[PDB]
Amino acid sequence: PIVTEQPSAEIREAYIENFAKGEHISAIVPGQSISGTLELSAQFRVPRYHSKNSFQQALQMKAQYYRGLPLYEKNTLLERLKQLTPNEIKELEHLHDAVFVNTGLQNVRKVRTKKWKKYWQYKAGIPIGLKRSQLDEFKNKYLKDVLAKRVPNPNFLGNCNIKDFKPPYIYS
Amino acid sequence: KYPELLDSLAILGMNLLSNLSQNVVPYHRNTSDYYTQHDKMVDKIF
Amino acid sequence: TRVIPQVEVGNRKHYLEDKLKVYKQAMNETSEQLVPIRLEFDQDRDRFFLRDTLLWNKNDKLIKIEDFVDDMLRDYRFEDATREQHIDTICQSIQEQIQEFQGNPYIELNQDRLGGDDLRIRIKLDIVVGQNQLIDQFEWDISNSDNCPEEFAESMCQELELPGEFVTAIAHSIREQVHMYHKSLALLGYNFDGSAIEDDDIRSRMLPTITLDDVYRPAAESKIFTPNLLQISAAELERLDKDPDIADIPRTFRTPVPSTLMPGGVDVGPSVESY
Amino acid sequence: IPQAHEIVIPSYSKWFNLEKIHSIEVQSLPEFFTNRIPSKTPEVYMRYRNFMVNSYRLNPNEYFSVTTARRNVSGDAAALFRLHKFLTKWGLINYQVDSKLLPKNIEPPLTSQYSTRHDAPRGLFPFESYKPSVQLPDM
Amino acid sequence: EVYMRYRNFMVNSYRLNPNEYFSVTTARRNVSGDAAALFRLHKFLTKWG
C-alpha cells in the first residue's frame, strides 16, 4: 500500500510499447510515488473567538501541550483574557492557527519521511527495514536470491568480470 | 569516426612543449591538484 | 584485432564538443535569461502524444536544439521511425517559443529599484505528478528582481515533503505566469517606470494595497491560500489525461519517463535484480 | 499571575527587541525602508516580524514553516520567505527544534561509502617473475 | 556548490541501479536549472565513465 506504481509488469510493458509507437492503451499507468495526502483546510480551521457581531459592536463602542498550545489553569486564565482588548483578539486567533498548523505539519513530516525511506529501500532492491545488524544476512540472502533458472549479471555483488591478480610475495 | 582523438594528441604536445621551454616538469607535482545576493548580504552582516 | 572507434552506450554515440567555443561563451557571459518552454502534442492531431515542461537559457550558443531534441526522444524510448518523423515538429515548436521571449522588462529597461513597484498577482498551481495533485495559490510580486522561483519552490517542497518533480514543476509554473503578465503588459503601451497602470482588464487582476488592518487575512480567504495534495482515483486520472489570455492558466501533467528509481516515472526497465 | 514560558536565544541576538527596529535589520532587509513603496512600510514589517516570532515562541520545539506565514498574513510570498530566512539566521526562530526534525530534501541516499573496481587497459601493468624470499635467510 | 549538488545527485542516483541508462530527462525533471548546463554536465559525466 505504500508505493502506488501499477503492480502488473505486463500492462506497463504494453503501455510503453504502444507509447513508442505513438498509440494509447486502455489501462492507466501512473508514475511511482508513496501513498498519502495532505488535506490542509479540510482540517484545522481558523477559530472564531469572536461572535458574529462582536467586532462591529466594539467598533460602535470604540474599543502537556494539547496540540501546540500548553494547558491552562482556570483561575490564572480567566484574568488574562479579561485583560486583553478586542483589537488583540484577531492576533490571538492567528497565532493559534500558526501553532496548530505547525504541529500538524511536523506530524505529517515524520510520517512522510518514514514512508520515503521505505520507498527508497524498496526501489534499491534491499528487502525492507534492514538494520545495521542484518547486513551480512542480507549478503547470505543474496545467495538464496539466485537459488530460488537465474544467471547473475556482471552487475551482481560478487560477480564482477574483473578479479584480483595477487602479487608475487603472496604465496598460497 | 572519432575526430577528438587528434585534438587530444595535439593539445598534449602543446603543453609538453611549454613545460620543456620554461624548465618545468608536469608529473608528480607535489601539489594538491584539487580545488542569492540578499543571503550573502545577510550572512556578511552576520 | 580491430580498431573500434567507440562502443555505443545506450545505443548512442558519445557527444564531442568544440572547446574553443565553450571557453569563448564562458569567458564573456553576463546574464542567464531563462525561457519557460512547454511541449504538448495530442494523438488525434500529429500522431504522437507527449507533454513536458522545460527551462532554456536564451543566451546559449553552444547546444543545437536538434541534438537536444534527438537526445530527449531517445530518453523516452521512441522507435527510430517515430523519432526521425517527429524531431522536426518538436524542434520547430521549441524554436518558436524562444523567439517570442522578448525578456524581462525591468532588466532590458533599467529600472531595478531594489524593492520594485507593488505589482502583485496571484499565482495558481495545479500539478498532477503521480497519483496525487497539488493545488495551491499565493501572491507574487512581479517588479522585484530579487524574487527567485527556484528557492521558493525548493522551500515549499521541503516543508511538505515532496519529490523533485514538484520542485521543477512549481518553478516552471511561477516563471510562466510571471512572463505571461510581463508580456501582456509590454504588449500594450506601458513604460515600466511610473506605475500608472492605465488599463482595465488588468489592474483588476493585481492585488490591492496592504496598508494596515489588511495585513491579517480573513478566515474565508485563509482556506484559499493554503496548499492541498489530493490523491485522485483512476477515473479522474483518465479524465484529467483526456481533457496571451490571463483567464485560463495551463496545468502541468507530464508524461512519465521510463525510470526505475525516480518518483513520477514508469518502471519498464532492466530490473534492479541482475539476472 | 500570567503563565510563564522559557525560551533560549543565541548570545549574539540580544540586540533584537520588539517595539524597536535595529540598524542590522535596516541594512539586512532594505526593502521595507526605501520610502517609495506604500505597502512595504516599517509598520507592516514590524507586524510581520512580531507575528512570526510570537507564534513561534508559543511552542518553541515546533518548526515554524513559511507555509503558515503565507496562510495567515497577506503579502508577497517571497518577501515573507526572505524575512523568515533572515529570522532563522539570527537565531530567533526554530532554535530549540530537534535536529532530524528539520525539513530536508527528498533525494536518493548517498553512495559515497561504496567500493569500486577499475577497468584497466592491456599494457598498463608489467609482467613479473621472481617470487622473492619473504623470509629471513638461515645463518 | 551548485556544481557539486548536481553532480553528486546524478552519480548517487545512477549507482542505485547500474543496469539502467540514467537519462538527461530525469535529471532535468528532478533538479532545477536551465537544460543546457545540465545537458553539458551529463555529457561530461557519461563521457568520463
XYZ file of C-alpha atoms in Angstrom:
681
model
C 0.000 0.000 0.000
C 2.996 2.308 0.409
C 4.013 2.671 -3.241
C 1.467 3.472 -5.947
C 3.011 2.046 -9.123
C 0.818 -0.058 -11.365
C 1.553 -3.507 -9.903
C 1.491 -5.645 -13.079
C 4.543 -5.524 -15.333
C 2.614 -6.630 -18.418
C 0.451 -3.519 -18.593
C 3.483 -1.291 -18.074
C 5.342 -3.016 -20.907
C 2.353 -2.826 -23.253
C 1.880 0.836 -22.337
C 5.479 1.691 -23.143
C 5.463 -0.246 -26.410
C 2.319 1.489 -27.648
C 3.782 4.788 -26.460
C 6.909 4.109 -28.504
C 4.620 3.601 -31.489
C 2.514 6.654 -30.628
C -0.770 4.952 -29.740
C -2.733 4.816 -26.489
C -3.828 1.801 -24.445
C -6.864 1.142 -22.273
C -5.449 0.924 -18.752
C -3.965 3.835 -16.797
C -0.292 3.817 -15.804
C 0.622 6.470 -13.225
C 4.108 7.256 -12.018
C 5.674 5.745 -8.914
C 5.242 7.539 -5.595
C 4.259 6.927 -1.997
C 0.614 6.999 -0.989
C -0.944 9.564 1.310
C -2.443 13.039 1.185
C -2.145 16.399 2.924
C -5.633 17.894 3.124
C -4.978 21.160 4.910
C -8.050 23.368 5.382
C -10.073 20.176 5.211
C -8.699 20.131 8.728
C -7.816 22.654 11.447
C -9.760 25.828 10.669
C -9.483 29.367 11.987
C -11.015 29.525 15.481
C -13.658 32.196 15.967
C -13.081 33.606 19.431
C -15.411 36.429 18.398
C -19.151 36.186 17.955
C -20.883 37.300 14.769
C -21.434 40.933 15.780
C -18.758 41.368 18.453
C -16.330 43.350 16.298
C -18.898 45.782 14.891
C -20.309 46.432 18.366
C -16.767 47.029 19.607
C -16.368 49.472 16.714
C -19.515 51.380 17.679
C -18.378 51.436 21.316
C -14.815 52.240 20.147
C -12.710 49.515 21.761
C 1.431 18.638 28.322
C 0.564 20.505 25.133
C -2.897 19.836 23.725
C -1.965 20.230 20.071
C 0.582 23.020 20.095
C -0.840 25.088 22.906
C 0.084 24.255 26.502
C -2.659 23.537 29.012
C -4.035 26.447 31.025
C -5.368 26.845 34.564
C -8.864 28.244 35.055
C -8.063 30.800 37.758
C -4.988 32.407 36.204
C -6.544 32.182 32.733
C -9.833 33.946 33.478
C -7.822 37.052 34.399
C -5.524 37.293 31.376
C -8.353 37.062 28.852
C -10.224 39.712 30.826
C -7.175 41.951 30.465
C -6.900 41.826 26.680
C -8.570 44.272 24.200
C -10.757 43.375 21.199
C -8.059 44.753 18.925
C -5.810 41.930 20.160
C -8.218 39.008 19.714
C -7.526 38.760 15.975
C -3.796 38.431 16.609
C -4.637 35.680 19.090
C -6.695 33.679 16.616
C -3.907 33.917 14.075
C -1.128 32.891 16.467
C -3.214 29.866 17.414
C -3.724 28.955 13.753
C 0.017 29.189 13.240
C 0.800 26.833 16.116
C -1.891 24.295 15.174
C -0.804 24.077 11.537
C 2.862 23.902 12.510
C 2.215 20.887 14.735
C 0.171 19.186 12.025
C 2.956 19.707 9.505
C 5.508 18.317 11.971
C 3.477 15.119 12.260
C 2.957 14.650 8.529
C 6.666 15.310 8.017
C 7.552 12.430 10.331
C 5.139 10.072 8.575
C 6.244 11.010 5.060
C 9.947 10.682 5.850
C 9.390 7.151 7.145
C 7.438 6.258 4.014
C 10.112 7.743 1.746
C 12.848 5.731 3.456
C 10.813 2.588 2.838
C 10.242 3.643 -0.783
C 13.947 4.132 -1.464
C 14.714 0.783 0.174
C 12.123 -0.966 -1.979
C 13.382 0.668 -5.178
C 17.046 -0.069 -4.485
C 16.294 -3.775 -4.036
C 17.028 -4.011 -0.291
C 14.232 -6.116 1.270
C 12.735 -3.600 3.725
C 13.644 -2.036 7.074
C 17.143 -3.519 7.238
C 19.034 -2.934 10.470
C 22.768 -2.410 10.869
C 22.887 -5.924 12.332
C 21.337 -7.751 9.357
C 23.813 -6.634 6.675
C 25.733 -9.901 6.334
C 22.499 -11.892 6.483
C 21.420 -9.721 3.555
C 24.517 -10.925 1.705
C 23.541 -14.501 2.569
C 20.034 -13.660 1.367
C 21.645 -12.777 -1.961
C 22.730 -16.390 -2.310
C 19.156 -17.517 -1.669
C 18.038 -14.976 -4.269
C 19.780 -16.765 -7.130
C 18.891 -20.226 -5.818
C 15.153 -19.524 -5.836
C 16.950 -20.760 -13.648
C 18.555 -17.416 -12.812
C 22.047 -16.474 -14.009
C 23.727 -13.455 -12.374
C 24.888 -10.408 -14.320
C 28.306 -8.794 -14.094
C 26.413 -6.105 -12.125
C 25.836 -8.519 -9.264
C 27.586 -8.401 -5.909
C 30.494 -10.814 -6.138
C 30.004 -11.493 -9.859
C 32.434 -8.949 -11.295
C 34.225 -9.748 -14.536
C 37.388 -8.271 -13.012
C 39.226 -10.434 -10.478
C 42.195 -9.659 -8.249
C 45.642 -10.656 -9.523
C 47.685 -11.475 -6.446
C 51.263 -10.206 -6.062
C 54.312 -12.491 -6.110
C 55.038 -12.148 -2.384
C 51.656 -13.714 -1.630
C 52.405 -17.418 -1.686
C 49.357 -19.705 -1.487
C 34.671 8.247 -36.961
C 36.367 9.703 -33.877
C 37.988 13.089 -34.547
C 38.515 14.339 -30.980
C 41.452 11.935 -30.709
C 43.551 14.226 -32.890
C 42.827 17.226 -30.672
C 43.934 15.286 -27.597
C 47.323 14.477 -29.087
C 47.978 17.999 -30.308
C 46.841 19.596 -27.068
C 49.029 17.255 -25.046
C 52.014 18.067 -27.230
C 51.483 21.788 -26.796
C 51.548 21.648 -23.012
C 54.658 19.483 -23.051
C 56.462 21.989 -25.252
C 55.582 24.741 -22.790
C 56.860 22.717 -19.846
C 60.035 21.992 -21.781
C 60.785 25.627 -22.565
C 60.335 27.000 -19.040
C 62.156 24.151 -17.247
C 59.069 22.703 -15.567
C 58.171 19.060 -15.003
C 54.427 18.319 -15.055
C 54.344 14.932 -13.310
C 54.396 14.229 -9.561
C 53.882 17.902 -8.825
C 53.861 17.581 -5.006
C 50.888 19.963 -5.109
C 47.241 19.101 -4.428
C 45.699 19.026 -7.965
C 42.208 19.554 -6.473
C 40.090 22.605 -5.751
C 21.310 34.958 -3.936
C 22.860 38.365 -3.289
C 20.420 39.028 -0.443
C 21.508 35.943 1.506
C 25.151 36.908 1.008
C 24.463 40.427 2.247
C 22.742 38.957 5.306
C 25.429 36.460 6.274
C 28.159 39.020 5.548
C 26.481 41.357 8.030
C 26.451 38.351 10.361
C 42.493 -7.463 -33.521
C 40.449 -4.428 -34.545
C 40.334 -0.681 -34.399
C 36.989 0.265 -32.863
C 36.180 4.000 -32.813
C 33.993 3.609 -29.714
C 31.437 1.391 -28.007
C 27.878 2.697 -28.003
C 26.386 3.408 -24.578
C 22.621 3.072 -24.503
C 22.619 2.748 -28.309
C 24.100 6.245 -28.627
C 27.364 7.849 -29.660
C 29.472 9.995 -27.370
C 28.994 13.755 -27.571
C 32.061 15.697 -28.721
C 32.015 19.486 -28.468
C 34.207 22.403 -29.512
C 36.254 23.591 -26.543
C 37.206 26.944 -28.064
C 33.533 27.862 -28.419
C 32.963 26.642 -24.862
C 35.619 28.955 -23.453
C 34.505 31.799 -25.719
C 30.973 31.656 -24.344
C 32.051 31.027 -20.752
C 34.506 33.923 -20.591
C 32.102 36.554 -21.989
C 28.895 35.715 -20.109
C 26.837 38.326 -18.284
C 23.265 37.126 -17.729
C 21.127 33.974 -17.652
C 17.882 34.839 -19.462
C 15.623 31.792 -18.899
C 12.679 30.844 -21.137
C 9.852 28.587 -19.903
C 9.121 26.037 -22.641
C 6.002 23.871 -22.768
C 5.532 20.903 -25.109
C 2.060 19.466 -25.716
C 1.128 17.051 -28.507
C -2.120 15.063 -28.771
C -2.823 11.910 -30.748
C -5.940 12.989 -32.680
C -3.553 15.566 -34.141
C 0.095 14.917 -35.028
C 0.468 11.216 -34.485
C 2.369 11.027 -31.181
C 1.360 12.319 -27.752
C 3.858 13.946 -25.403
C 3.760 16.582 -22.657
C 6.674 18.256 -20.912
C 7.916 21.465 -19.316
C 11.417 22.823 -19.504
C 13.648 25.835 -18.920
C 16.062 27.031 -21.575
C 18.784 29.683 -21.465
C 18.312 32.046 -24.393
C 21.876 33.405 -24.196
C 23.146 29.967 -25.209
C 25.055 29.398 -28.442
C 26.647 26.032 -27.641
C 23.926 23.375 -27.901
C 21.813 22.884 -31.012
C 18.117 22.316 -30.402
C 18.146 19.409 -32.847
C 20.709 17.480 -30.784
C 18.838 18.213 -27.562
C 15.533 17.032 -29.036
C 17.074 13.898 -30.539
C 18.549 13.006 -27.156
C 15.233 13.724 -25.427
C 13.323 11.483 -27.829
C 15.888 8.763 -27.205
C 15.263 9.144 -23.463
C 11.534 8.483 -23.918
C 12.363 5.259 -25.805
C 10.704 6.200 -29.066
C 11.155 3.929 -32.050
C 13.612 5.005 -34.735
C 10.893 5.708 -37.294
C 8.763 7.865 -34.991
C 11.780 9.836 -33.778
C 13.023 10.531 -37.306
C 9.496 11.595 -38.239
C 8.707 13.986 -35.402
C 12.052 15.510 -34.372
C 11.381 18.290 -36.896
C 7.960 19.165 -35.482
C 9.312 19.216 -31.938
C 12.307 21.343 -32.938
C 10.075 23.907 -34.638
C 7.804 24.042 -31.593
C 10.787 24.690 -29.322
C 12.355 27.208 -31.705
C 9.238 29.364 -31.932
C 8.881 29.891 -28.184
C 12.460 31.146 -27.853
C 11.885 33.859 -30.458
C 8.757 35.316 -28.832
C 10.509 35.586 -25.445
C 11.493 39.269 -25.612
C 12.549 39.128 -21.971
C 12.202 40.756 -18.552
C 11.262 44.430 -18.982
C 12.663 45.745 -15.705
C 16.076 44.460 -16.844
C 16.270 45.342 -20.542
C 14.828 48.687 -19.468
C 16.953 49.627 -16.473
C 14.592 50.059 -13.518
C 15.889 47.852 -10.647
C 14.534 49.909 -7.743
C 15.688 47.433 -5.055
C 12.114 46.876 -3.929
C 10.406 47.107 -7.280
C 6.959 48.550 -7.696
C 3.993 46.850 -5.980
C 2.506 44.965 -8.948
C 1.374 41.762 -7.244
C -0.513 38.912 -8.877
C -1.984 35.616 -7.773
C -0.095 32.517 -8.891
C -2.201 29.361 -9.065
C -0.769 25.853 -9.220
C -2.271 22.582 -10.401
C 0.350 19.825 -10.675
C -0.555 16.171 -11.176
C 2.705 14.253 -10.653
C 1.936 10.603 -9.942
C -1.458 9.739 -8.477
C -1.579 12.980 -6.469
C -2.490 16.537 -7.372
C -1.102 19.639 -5.689
C -3.397 22.675 -5.720
C -2.134 25.960 -4.312
C -2.371 29.722 -4.675
C -0.128 32.514 -3.454
C 0.751 36.144 -4.074
C 3.821 37.009 -6.117
C 5.245 40.444 -6.871
C 6.475 40.991 -10.405
C 8.581 44.124 -10.230
C 11.204 42.770 -7.881
C 14.278 41.166 -9.409
C 15.144 39.565 -6.061
C 12.304 37.047 -6.172
C 13.851 33.738 -7.243
C 11.305 30.987 -8.004
C 13.785 28.133 -7.513
C 14.437 28.858 -3.841
C 10.734 29.327 -3.122
C 9.755 26.064 -4.808
C 12.568 24.238 -3.022
C 11.436 25.586 0.354
C 7.801 24.635 -0.207
C 8.695 21.121 -1.322
C 10.937 20.693 1.718
C 8.151 21.811 4.031
C 5.580 19.440 2.502
C 7.991 16.521 1.834
C 7.587 16.353 -1.926
C 9.947 14.955 -4.589
C 11.871 16.934 -7.184
C 9.221 16.649 -9.884
C 7.057 19.054 -7.912
C 10.035 21.382 -7.411
C 10.719 21.798 -11.110
C 7.019 21.970 -11.975
C 6.416 24.759 -9.446
C 9.442 26.768 -10.564
C 8.342 26.489 -14.184
C 4.758 27.489 -13.359
C 5.841 30.582 -11.433
C 8.119 31.695 -14.264
C 5.460 31.004 -16.890
C 2.742 33.085 -15.267
C 5.112 35.920 -14.380
C 6.143 36.095 -18.023
C 2.539 35.971 -19.225
C 1.902 39.113 -17.197
C 5.126 40.825 -18.335
C 4.204 40.097 -21.944
C 0.602 41.259 -21.668
C 1.823 44.492 -20.074
C 4.569 45.295 -22.579
C 2.311 44.331 -25.494
C 0.135 47.320 -24.706
C 1.763 50.673 -24.186
C 3.420 50.549 -20.768
C 6.764 52.069 -19.849
C 7.732 50.089 -16.786
C 8.528 53.212 -14.754
C 5.963 55.493 -13.168
C 3.456 52.801 -12.342
C 0.231 54.432 -13.599
C -1.081 51.048 -14.729
C -3.580 52.727 -17.071
C -5.781 49.792 -18.038
C -8.959 47.979 -17.045
C -8.822 44.237 -17.758
C -5.580 44.219 -15.806
C -5.319 46.479 -12.779
C -8.351 44.306 -11.978
C -6.124 41.246 -11.572
C -3.449 42.888 -9.434
C -3.861 42.780 -5.727
C -4.747 45.940 -3.792
C -2.560 47.852 -1.380
C -1.804 46.326 2.010
C -1.721 49.465 4.120
C -2.629 48.023 7.536
C -5.694 46.283 9.041
C -5.354 44.412 5.727
C -2.183 42.575 6.756
C -4.207 39.889 8.547
C -6.208 37.620 6.295
C -9.908 36.741 6.768
C -10.832 33.174 7.610
C -12.752 32.632 4.370
C -9.604 33.525 2.428
C -7.113 31.625 4.581
C -8.637 28.414 3.216
C -7.814 29.518 -0.331
C -4.153 30.461 0.203
C -3.133 27.070 1.562
C -1.725 24.006 -0.220
C -3.565 20.740 -0.754
C -2.312 17.399 -2.057
C -5.394 15.445 -3.125
C -4.999 11.888 -4.382
C -7.281 11.081 -7.303
C -8.884 7.837 -8.449
C -8.280 6.131 -11.780
C -11.383 7.666 -13.360
C -10.484 11.284 -12.620
C -6.894 10.482 -13.583
C -8.080 9.373 -17.018
C -10.377 12.400 -17.237
C -7.528 14.815 -16.489
C -5.473 12.903 -19.050
C -8.052 13.273 -21.835
C -9.049 16.904 -21.283
C -1.865 35.952 -24.013
C -5.096 35.076 -22.224
C -4.860 35.562 -18.463
C -8.203 33.923 -17.672
C -7.091 30.310 -18.167
C -3.750 29.187 -16.731
C -2.257 25.921 -18.035
C -1.845 22.979 -15.680
C 1.092 20.565 -15.575
C 0.675 16.860 -16.383
C 3.881 15.440 -17.839
C 4.016 12.010 -19.414
C 6.135 9.689 -17.245
C 9.760 8.942 -18.125
C 10.815 5.271 -18.150
C 12.949 5.318 -14.986
C 13.214 2.529 -12.422
C 14.030 4.715 -9.414
C 12.698 8.236 -9.676
C 9.191 9.135 -8.485
C 6.881 10.088 -11.300
C 8.302 7.652 -13.842
C 7.284 4.264 -15.165
C 9.246 1.132 -14.280
C 9.690 -0.509 -17.700
C 13.397 -1.189 -17.448
C 16.217 -3.564 -16.591
C 15.289 -4.703 -13.109
C 17.415 -3.955 -10.061
C 17.668 -7.716 -9.785
C 20.551 -8.593 -12.079
C 19.709 -11.807 -13.925
C -0.094 35.987 37.534
C 0.160 35.146 33.800
C 1.666 31.781 32.932
C 5.371 31.742 32.146
C 7.472 30.279 29.353
C 11.194 29.856 28.917
C 12.976 30.202 25.590
C 16.623 30.459 24.520
C 18.428 32.948 22.285
C 21.996 32.940 20.949
C 24.102 35.493 22.786
C 24.725 37.481 19.597
C 20.987 38.169 19.219
C 20.456 40.269 22.353
C 20.214 43.340 20.120
C 16.802 42.131 18.965
C 13.947 43.820 20.795
C 10.289 44.226 19.978
C 8.846 47.734 19.635
C 12.218 48.615 18.091
C 13.980 48.414 14.738
C 17.738 47.877 14.733
C 20.220 49.037 12.123
C 21.156 45.408 11.420
C 17.594 44.820 10.247
C 17.565 48.013 8.171
C 20.751 47.011 6.364
C 19.804 43.325 6.059
C 16.232 43.777 4.742
C 16.412 47.011 2.728
C 13.015 46.638 1.032
C 10.835 47.714 3.957
C 12.627 51.048 4.367
C 13.045 52.615 0.927
C 10.379 55.307 1.106
C 8.976 54.587 -2.358
C 6.502 51.758 -1.735
C 3.280 52.314 0.241
C 2.739 48.651 1.145
C 6.255 47.920 2.419
C 6.295 50.242 5.444
C 8.313 49.654 8.631
C 4.980 49.490 10.462
C 3.826 46.448 8.492
C 7.334 44.981 8.682
C 7.172 45.132 12.464
C 3.841 43.310 12.348
C 5.145 40.531 10.094
C 8.141 40.024 12.370
C 6.097 40.125 15.570
C 3.566 37.621 14.254
C 6.269 35.167 13.247
C 8.353 35.453 16.426
C 5.405 35.404 18.833
C 3.679 32.452 17.195
C 6.969 30.580 17.280
C 7.549 31.285 20.969
C 4.138 29.856 21.902
C 5.704 26.402 21.445
C 9.463 26.588 20.920
C 10.005 22.963 19.837
C 7.773 23.116 16.752
C 9.351 24.173 13.482
C 7.788 27.384 12.187
C 7.227 26.987 8.450
C 6.780 29.725 5.867
C 3.628 27.916 4.719
C 1.679 29.033 7.794
C 3.048 32.568 7.472
C 1.813 32.594 3.881
C -1.541 31.225 5.045
C -2.271 33.753 7.801
C -0.620 37.002 6.697
C -1.374 38.861 3.468
C 1.577 39.996 1.387
C 4.134 38.997 -1.199
C 5.279 35.431 -0.596
C 8.957 35.944 -1.419
C 9.185 38.892 0.969
C 7.886 36.656 3.748
C 10.318 33.976 2.598
C 13.290 36.338 2.899
C 12.103 37.622 6.271
C 11.709 34.059 7.563
C 15.202 33.171 6.350
C 16.699 36.259 7.992
C 14.938 35.469 11.260
C 16.256 31.902 11.186
C 19.769 33.222 10.514
C 19.986 35.343 13.683
C 18.750 32.545 15.889
C 15.429 34.000 16.960
C 13.398 31.295 15.119
C 13.286 27.433 15.461
C 16.398 27.369 17.744
C 15.053 24.599 20.097
C 13.635 22.141 17.423
C 15.486 18.786 17.486
C 17.690 18.149 14.504
C 16.350 15.263 12.394
C 13.016 17.094 12.739
C 14.061 19.900 10.402
C 12.810 19.597 6.808
C 15.131 18.120 4.208
C 15.171 17.326 0.510
C 13.670 14.120 -0.870
C 16.693 12.720 -2.694
C 18.258 9.319 -3.306
C 20.579 8.304 -0.457
C 24.329 8.797 -0.555
C 26.675 6.324 -2.241
C 29.977 7.742 -1.021
C 30.978 4.759 1.142
C 30.992 2.332 -1.804
C 33.765 0.088 -3.104
C 34.609 0.449 -6.791
C 36.616 -1.691 -9.210
C 38.748 -0.280 -12.009
C 38.772 -1.461 -15.622
C 42.321 -1.202 -16.945
C 43.822 -1.433 -20.445
C 46.170 -4.174 -21.529
C 49.714 -2.871 -21.310
C 49.294 -0.921 -18.074
C 50.992 -3.378 -15.727
C 54.300 -5.169 -16.340
C 54.866 -8.896 -16.492
C 56.577 -10.188 -13.357
C 58.691 -13.208 -12.447
C 60.838 -13.981 -9.400
C 58.772 -14.709 -6.261
C 61.029 -13.014 -3.626
C 62.047 -14.836 -0.344
C 59.602 -13.021 2.076
C 61.509 -14.853 4.900
C 64.893 -14.067 6.603
C 67.758 -16.421 5.480
C 69.151 -19.001 7.993
C 72.732 -18.194 9.182
C 28.353 24.441 -4.590
C 25.605 24.083 -7.204
C 28.004 22.080 -9.354
C 28.692 19.572 -6.587
C 24.963 19.423 -5.825
C 24.040 18.467 -9.398
C 26.989 16.135 -9.939
C 26.526 14.175 -6.725
C 22.801 13.912 -7.400
C 23.462 12.376 -10.809
C 26.125 9.945 -9.599
C 24.234 8.806 -6.492
C 21.050 8.331 -8.483
C 22.838 6.285 -11.142
C 24.728 3.983 -8.775
C 21.484 2.710 -7.235
C 20.768 0.710 -10.402
C 23.811 0.371 -12.673
C 21.865 -1.763 -15.151
C 19.720 1.130 -16.363
C 20.536 4.131 -18.509
C 20.330 7.353 -16.491
C 18.974 9.919 -18.930
C 19.022 13.696 -19.156
C 15.229 13.984 -18.968
C 15.111 12.581 -15.439
C 17.871 14.888 -14.219
C 16.240 17.847 -15.954
C 12.979 16.922 -14.241
C 14.376 16.391 -10.741
C 16.864 19.272 -10.368
C 16.075 22.879 -11.245
C 18.147 24.797 -13.782
C 18.438 25.500 -17.466
C 18.503 22.313 -19.503
C 21.629 23.312 -21.441
C 24.027 23.294 -18.489
C 22.523 20.030 -17.242
C 22.987 18.561 -20.717
C 26.638 19.608 -20.721
C 27.277 18.182 -17.249
C 25.513 14.906 -18.045
C 27.579 14.502 -21.204
C 30.817 15.257 -19.354
C 29.967 12.654 -16.729
C 28.857 9.945 -19.157
C 31.992 10.663 -21.189
C 34.486 10.158 -18.363
C 32.855 6.926 -17.236
